Amino acid sequence: SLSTINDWDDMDDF
Amino acid sequence: SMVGQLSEGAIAAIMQKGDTNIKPILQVINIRPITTGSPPRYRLLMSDGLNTLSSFMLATQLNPLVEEEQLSSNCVCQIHRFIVNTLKDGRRVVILMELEVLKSAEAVGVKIGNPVPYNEG
């Protein structure tokens, strides 16, 4: 999915 | 033909070669806000006339182009700066940082040609 902003960036995601 | 206005092949080049030096001319097919919950973020379905690809996000600095309806579905634009990032699972995303609207949506009026979804796996 790319439908939420978190989907676009894994390394900022904890 | 109308597709003579678009950079045929640029989508595969963006996703496969990743050379950020090209300045491809692409058509916006659709624009959708991304769930944010804050500054809104916009996802774009783009076409080079051969392929469509929905893995484009506008840099937030370009949000006024969408919100003031200067960048809208069917318009033709030239990408002047973009970056490609690769996610943990291998998917690639494109952030559009600078672009120029060459022809407004109203002046183009329709999806150009018959582009098919890009095969990324």
Numbering used by the authors:
A (entry chain B): 147 to 160
B (entry chain A): 0 to 36, 38 to 121
Text from the published report:
In the structure of RPA70N–BLMp1, BLMp1 also adopts a kinked conformation and bridges two RPA70N molecules. However, one major difference is that BLMp1 binds to RPA70N in the reverse direction when compared to BLMp2, HelB or DNA2. The N-terminal part of BLMp1 forms a one-turn helix followed by a γ turn. BLM W154 inserts into a hydrophobic pocket formed by RPA70N V93, I95, M57, I33 and the aliphatic part of R43, and stacks with M57. The C-terminal part of BLMp1 adopts an extended conformation, with F160 anchored in the side pocket of a nearby RPA70Nb. The RPA70Nb residues R43b, R31b also interact with the BLM D158 side chain and with main chain oxygen atoms of D159 and M157. The KD of the BLMp1–RPA70N complex, as determined by ITC, is around 16.7 μM, similar to that of the corresponding BLMp2 complex. Mutation of BLM F160 to alanine greatly reduced the affinity between BLMp1 and RPA70N, resulting in a KD of around 85 μM. The way that BLMp1 bridges two RPA70N molecules is analogous to the role of the p53 peptide.
The heterotrimeric Replication protein A (RPA) is the ubiquitous eukaryotic single-stranded DNA (ssDNA) binding protein and participates in nearly all aspects of DNA metabolism, especially DNA damage response. The N-terminal OB domain of the RPA70 subunit (RPA70N) is a major protein-protein interaction element for RPA and binds to more than 20 partner proteins. The RPA70N domain adopts an OB fold with a five-stranded anti-parallel beta-barrel but has very weak ssDNA affinity. Its primary role is to mediate protein–protein interaction with its basic and hydrophobic groove and a side pocket, as first shown by a series of studies of RPA70N interacting with p53.
